[PDB]
């Protein structure tokens, strides 16, 4: 059949790359946010899960609790709970951002952007054919018939070099919401840093006691 | 049958809740570590299995790859696809720091320590109870045979408080194992927060640019 240039070919490349990639990007992401296969279920609709922290503080202070406060594990077991309950806390902001900011944008610019694409290189090859085949038999069919048939070809090419330019052309929007992704984390890793030393003073503050 | 002063029954409540919380805070912690159920037979031998993170990390770096350097978005993948795989080592040592010295030693504490107790606490009764019997049939039986009995009771006795009264006492130990916990875990978010700004540079300096 007809041909396309290599730059058209190479744009159509670099989109199913794309495509693949914002996929299994997707995926990971979300694997890694939760890993347990149970509560991806819930980041696969939106927190409607536990978190492991949040469970684990459940526990301590459960304990810590029971102990009673004449022991000195029993209290160092409500102070550390509390230091993972706001853990808890400040994960579910890291898996709401990263879904509202990374997830949810990818997903849409899947549905959205690249579907339409994958539209029209359909619609393209199509007119491709029919082309090749009117054109096979080109004494048998009207010139006419045949100017459209290429004419529609034609047409339908510039519309996909347009449709996937323009995807490619602004990739950078990507790396955005690439950034956008470490930024979430970032913001997490950093509030957790907090917790994590806010607590460690009140624990140095009993084992250096007595 | 005879019975144990409220100190006695004290000392022994909170072993049992030390024992309990032991487990369950062990168990939980590890869910915490890896909360996909199939990755903890892992970390419930030793690490032999993936992280998200490193996974995550290979697939951006695949596709950036893919991709190619004539774009923006292929590159941005391969950065923060590093950053991905750097934070899936300083997991790996979360995992190990937490599994040495915090998993281990209640482990340790429950096998060894309270073990000891438990069995202390189990020949007591019995001593109990032989006396108890023995001693409904006191006519019957040679005094010198149910004085023993009484001895041997009270002999038991004495272990049982002394094993449950030494771990109890030293209980801070395990304030410092929860410490143990919380600064491997410091370590690690400290460590983290690092490899996340490193990378923000990176793509900050992509997207101020174009």
Redesign the interface.
């Known amino acids: 059949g007809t041909k396309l240039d290599d730059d058209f070919k190479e744009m159509e490349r670099?989109v199913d790359?794309?495509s693949?990639?914002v996929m299994?990007?997707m995926t990971?992401?979300i694997?890694?946010l939760?890993?347990?296969?149970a509560?991806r279920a819930k980041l696969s609709m939106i927190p409607g899960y536990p978190q492991?922290?949040a469970?684990?503080a459940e526990?301590?202070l459960?304990?810590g609790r029971?102990?009673?406060d004449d022991?000195?594990?029993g209290p160092?077991?409500g102070?550390?709970g509390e230091?993972m309950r706001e853990l808890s806390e400040v994960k579910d902001s890291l898996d709401i951002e990263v879904k509202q900011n990374f997830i949810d944008p990818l997903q849409n610019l899947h549905d959205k952007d690249l579907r339409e694409i994958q539209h029209h290189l359909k619609k393209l090859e199509g007119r491709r054919l029919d082309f090749d085949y009117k054109k096979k038999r080109q004494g048998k069919i009207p010139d006419e018939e045949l100017r459209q048939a290429l004419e529609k070809f034609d047409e339908s090419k510039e519309i996909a070099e347009s449709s996937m330019f323009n995807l490619?052309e602004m990739?950078?929007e990507?790396?955005?919401q690439?950034?956008a992704?470490?930024?979430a984390?970032?913001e997490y890793?950093?509030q957790?840093?907090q917790i994590?030393?806010q607590?460690?003073v009140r624990?140095?503050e009993?084992?250096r006691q007595?």
């Open positions: 670099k790359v794309t693949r990639a299994e990007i990971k992401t694997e890694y939760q890993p347990n296969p509560s492991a922290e469970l684990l526990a301590m459960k304990f029971e102990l009673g022991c000195n594990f160092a077991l102070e550390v230091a490619l990739d950078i990507q790396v955005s690439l950034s992704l470490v930024q984390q970032l890793h950093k957790a840093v994590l030393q607590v460690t624990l140095e009993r084992i007595a």
